[PDB]
Amino acid sequence: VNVQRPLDALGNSLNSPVIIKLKGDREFRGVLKSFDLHMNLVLNDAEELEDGEVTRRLGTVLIRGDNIVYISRGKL
Amino acid sequence: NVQRPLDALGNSLNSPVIIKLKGDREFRGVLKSFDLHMNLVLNDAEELEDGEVTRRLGTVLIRGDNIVYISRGKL
Amino acid sequence: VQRPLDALGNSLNSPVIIKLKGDREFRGVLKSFDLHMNLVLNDAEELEDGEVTRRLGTVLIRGDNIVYISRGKLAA
Amino acid sequence: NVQRPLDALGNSLNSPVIIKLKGDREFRGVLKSFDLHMNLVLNDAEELEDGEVTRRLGTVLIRGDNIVYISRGKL
Amino acid sequence: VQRPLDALGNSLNSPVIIKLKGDREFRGVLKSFDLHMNLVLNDAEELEDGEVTRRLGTVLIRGDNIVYISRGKLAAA
Amino acid sequence: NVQRPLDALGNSLNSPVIIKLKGDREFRGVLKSFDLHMNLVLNDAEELEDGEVTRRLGTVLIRGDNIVYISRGKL
Amino acid sequence: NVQRPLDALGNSLNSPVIIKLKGDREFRGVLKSFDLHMNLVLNDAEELEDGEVTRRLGTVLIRGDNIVYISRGK
Numbered sequence: 001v002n003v004q005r006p007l008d009a010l011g012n013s014l015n016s017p018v019i020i021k022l023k024g025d026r027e028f029r030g031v032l033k034s035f036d037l038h039m040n041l042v043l044n045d046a047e048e049l050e051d052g053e054v055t056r057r058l059g060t061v062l063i064r065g066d067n068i069v070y071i072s073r074g075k076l
Numbered sequence: 077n078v079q080r081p082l083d084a085l086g087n088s089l090n091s092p093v094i095i096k097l098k099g100d101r102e103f104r105g106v107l108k109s110f111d112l113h114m115n116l117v118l119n120d121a122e123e124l125e126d127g128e129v130t131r132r133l134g135t136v137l138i139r140g141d142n143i144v145y146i147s148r149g150k151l
Numbered sequence: 152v153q154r155p156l157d158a159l160g161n162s163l164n165s166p167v168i169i170k171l172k173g174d175r176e177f178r179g180v181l182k183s184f185d186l187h188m189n190l191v192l193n194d195a196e197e198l199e200d201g202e203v204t205r206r207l208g209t210v211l212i213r214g215d216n217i218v219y220i221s222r223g224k225l226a227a
Numbered sequence: 228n229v230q231r232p233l234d235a236l237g238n239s240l241n242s243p244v245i246i247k248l249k250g251d252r253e254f255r256g257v258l259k260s261f262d263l264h265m266n267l268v269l270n271d272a273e274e275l276e277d278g279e280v281t282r283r284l285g286t287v288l289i290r291g292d293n294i295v296y297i298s299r300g301k302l
Numbered sequence: 303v304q305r306p307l308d309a310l311g312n313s314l315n316s317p318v319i320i321k322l323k324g325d326r327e328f329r330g331v332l333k334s335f336d337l338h339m340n341l342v343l344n345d346a347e348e349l350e351d352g353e354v355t356r357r358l359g360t361v362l363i364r365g366d367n368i369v370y371i372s373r374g375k376l377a378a379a
Numbered sequence: 380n381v382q383r384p385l386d387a388l389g390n391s392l393n394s395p396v397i398i399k400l401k402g403d404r405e406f407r408g409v410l411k412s413f414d415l416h417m418n419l420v421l422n423d424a425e426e427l428e429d430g431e432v433t434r435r436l437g438t439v440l441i442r443g444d445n446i447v448y449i450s451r452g453k454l
Numbered sequence: 455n456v457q458r459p460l461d462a463l464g465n466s467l468n469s470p471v472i473i474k475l476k477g478d479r480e481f482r483g484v485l486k487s488f489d490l491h492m493n494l495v496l497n498d499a500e501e502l503e504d505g506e507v508t509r510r511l512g513t514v515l516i517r518g519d520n521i522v523y524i525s526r527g528k
């Protein structure tokens with residue numbers, strides 16, 4: 001039982017809102033639909049935020065894992 | 077269900093997409109094919125800047141390591 | 152003496168400081184990690200030069216962004 | 228089910244292409260061959276800067292990791 | 303002659319200097335390392351421009367940030 | 380019939396080449412050998428800047444990941 | 455009969471060399487060993503920051519992925 005590895009723990013967020021910070025300072029929010037071991041992700045109803053402003057609505061999007069800094073839980 | 081990201085990408089073949097690259101370039105076009113490295117081939121592609129078409133390229137091969145995200149966007 | 156990734160096991164459930172490429176810093180409790188150095192922290196906070204820029208809660212950090220990991224001190 | 232990207236690139240062999248590299252740099256030439264890393268060999272290659280030719284290089288081997296995209300040239 | 307990573311073993315338990323990409327630098331006692339060059343330092347301190355910016359205690363440094371590793375000096379006395 | 384890039388490079392052994400690196404450094408010398416990572420050994424190597432020889436290095440080993448492209452020097 | 459690059463590098467063992475790094479740092483010293491990643495150990499190492507000595511290091515282990523080129527010194 002003693003603690004899931006990080007990529008297994010990530011599965012606990014499937015179908016939940018998440019916050020993704022990317023290299024280069026970009027930030028996105030959306031519902032996590034799937035991921036793989038490279039940390040590539042597919043999000044639904046995604047938006048890109050900038051200085052607290054939604055600067056773009058990305059709909060369903062695939063984010064390439066090597067651009068990611070961190071993934072955290074979003075409002076909800 | 078829910079396919080892994082690279083399998084789910086198959087559902088976008090023949091759909092219009094928006095590709096954002098590292099370093100800010102953006103491309104819009106119809107996804108024709110892809111592979112495991114995320115290398116992509118788009119038809120009727122154009123490069124954009126600030127919501128502006130700066131170049132019309134037709135069919136282009138995009139190297140996968142340059143990709144930040146692939147979006148299906150909004151109507 | 153344990154190899155680096157095995158010694159890190161010593162910090163599970165302990166407060167840590169994660170310094171990233173770009174000067175961003177995270178402080179939180181280490182819950183798990185994997186061989187790529189991907190990490191899960193609980194009660195995490197993000198910092199931009201001593202200033203707590205955000206309270207994340209549980210967060211997954213991609214290992215390729217890490218510069219170092221050191222011992223921190225727990226919150227209240 | 229169409230060709231994977233690197234298999235489709237084979238249809239441009241002996242044709243004019245535009246190679247965009249990271250850093251606004253760009254090459255034009257006839258595609259002679261390539262490999263799985265996307266390293267390429269171009270004939271009658273010319274390097275460009277802001278639409279203007281900077282150097283005529285002749286045959287050139289370009290390392291794949293420098294590539295942003297490949298498109299066809301109107302040559 | 304030993305290969306680089308094998309010769310590094312001779313520096314275990316000795317003070318070293320770790321120069322990183324971007325110029326920071328760490329000084330401390332080398333406790334262990336692995337084949338990716340990740341390493342563990344005891345009594346570590348971070349420096350920038352030669353001035354110590356913080357004392358970290360025991361630290362795990364990810365290897366791909368390393369430029370070089372050399373030996374450190376002991377206190378002037 | 381169509382030599383892959385790294386096999387074709389072998390045809391430049393012992394001839395003058397020009398190597399452009401990331402960050403715009405440029406070297407010229409006689410290609411002596413190379414490997415699959417594109418690491419190279421050059422004889423009579425010279426570093427160039429702006430267009431002028433800024434350094435004479437003799438025999439040099441260049442690490443492949445720094446390379447942008449390799450082309451033929453002058454006879 | 456030419457040796458592959460990493461094999462040709464063996465010829466410089468126990469000889470003075472110049473190591474130029476990504477960014478721009480430069481080191482001079484005697485090459486003692488290396489591995490397939492191009493990590494190197496130099497003896498009597500000295501760093502040069504634009505034409506001249508800025509730091510004497512003694513023995514140093516340079517990580518291979520930082521290297522741009524290696525040439526014969528002196």
Ligand SMILES: O=c1ccn([C@@H]2O[C@H](COP(=O)(O)O)[C@@H](O)[C@H]2O)c(=O)[nH]1
Nearest residue numbers: 037038040064065066067082112113114
């Ligand atoms: O689908 C893919 C394939 C590779 N990659 C990246 O390519 C590298 C592949 O190996 P890695 O997953 O162990 O890091 C690494 O930088 C990955 O993030 C993706 O991000 N997505």
Ligand SMILES: O=c1ccn([C@@H]2O[C@H](COP(=O)(O)O)[C@@H](O)[C@H]2O)c(=O)[nH]1
Nearest residue numbers: 337338339490491492493517518519520
């Ligand atoms: O000790 C190490 C481990 C990896 N590396 C680097 O990591 C990569 C590993 O691939 P390589 O085994 O082909 O050299 C490559 O870019 C290396 O230069 C080092 O330089 N030193």
Ligand SMILES: O=c1ccn([C@@H]2O[C@H](CO)[C@@H](O)[C@H]2O)c(=O)[nH]1
Nearest residue numbers: 113115139140141263264265292
């Ligand atoms: O045709 C290819 C081959 C590889 N890569 C990926 O791009 C990076 C280039 O250094 C590698 O990590 C590799 O996974 C591509 O994008 N396209």
Ligand SMILES: O=c1ccn([C@@H]2O[C@H](CO)[C@@H](O)[C@H]2O)c(=O)[nH]1
Nearest residue numbers: 037038039066187189213214215
């Ligand atoms: O999910 C993953 C998979 C791999 N890596 C590591 O990060 C680097 C990304 O290029 C690789 O060398 C790999 O070892 C991660 O940080 N996270």
Ligand SMILES: O=c1ccn([C@@H]2O[C@H](CO)[C@@H](O)[C@H]2O)c(=O)[nH]1
Nearest residue numbers: 264266290291292293415416417
């Ligand atoms: O001769 C070589 C060796 C490696 N690579 C890089 O190493 C990765 C191997 O998949 C590719 O993405 C590619 O960019 C090259 O471009 N050329």
Ligand SMILES: O=c1ccn([C@@H]2O[C@H](CO)[C@@H](O)[C@H]2O)c(=O)[nH]1
Nearest residue numbers: 186187188338340364365366367
């Ligand atoms: O814990 C790790 C795992 C990977 N890497 C780096 O990631 C790449 C994984 O193949 C290597 O080149 C290596 O430099 C590290 O520094 N530390």
Ligand SMILES: O=c1ccn([C@@H]2O[C@H](CO)[C@@H](O)[C@H]2O)c(=O)[nH]1
Nearest residue numbers: 416418442443444445490491492
């Ligand atoms: O001596 C070496 C070893 C590796 N590489 C490059 O660094 C990557 C290491 O996995 C490979 O794709 C390879 O092209 C070099 O340039 N030189």
